[PDB]
């Protein structure tokens, strides 16, 4: 029965994949808005 | 009975050959040879050799009787280009596409 075991309900959440398409919700800008220092790779200010 | 001859890899671009092929398409064969004898193109020499080869394949490999044959199909496909280099001014080069073609003459009596 190793093909009948199954995880709990709610334990494995999907994982945001950014940059794929328009339907996914997080495409083009991946959830990081328009230009600026925060929309840049490595970008962000210090603590 | 349809009888084919082809010249694959003919050094002449397919445009230049298609002018001549468009001349003899549909004609009876002796009339087509009389057209290609008096057409002053390089392509008419090539097309004439393919047509003469198709009459010979018809009369030898198939049933005879040249006088009933007609050029039913003729078409010129494009072959592979030979990519060469023309030296232009100021140090720049071009690719010359030395173009080939594939002449097909399907001759038939019906």
């Amino acid at each position: 029965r190793l093909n009948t075991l199954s995880p709990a309900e709610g334990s494995k959440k999907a994982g945001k994949r950014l940059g794929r398409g328009i339907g996914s919700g997080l495409g083009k800008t991946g959830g990081r808005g328009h230009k600026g220092q925060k929309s840049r790779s490595g970008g962000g200010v210090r603590r | 009975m349809e009888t084919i001859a082809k010249h694959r890899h003919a050094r002449s671009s397919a445009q230049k050959v298609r002018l001549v092929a468009d001349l003899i398409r549909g004609k009876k064969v002796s009339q087509a040879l009389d057209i290609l004898t008096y057409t002053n193109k390089k392509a008419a020499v090539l097309v004439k050799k393919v047509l003469e080869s198709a009459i010979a394949n018809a009369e030898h490999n198939d049933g005879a009787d040249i006088d009933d044959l007609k050029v039913t199909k003729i078409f010129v496909d494009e072959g592979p280009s030979m990519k060469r280099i023309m030296p232009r001014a100021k140090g720049r080069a071009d690719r010359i596409l030395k173009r080939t073609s594939h002449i097909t003459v399907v001759v038939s009596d019906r």
Partner: protein, 37 residues
């Protein structure tokens, strides 16, 4: 031919000449810029 074509596309990649566009193309861009000032 392919080797000569890759190198002879690689001819004006590290150029300097400023009156010639892209190293080689002649123009009037000196007078255009100079007249814009």
């Amino acid at each position: 031919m392919d080797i000569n074509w890759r190198h002879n596309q690689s001819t004006f990649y590290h150029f300097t000449s400023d009156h010639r566009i892209s190293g080689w193309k002649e123009t009037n861009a000196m007078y255009v810029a100079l007249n814009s000032q």
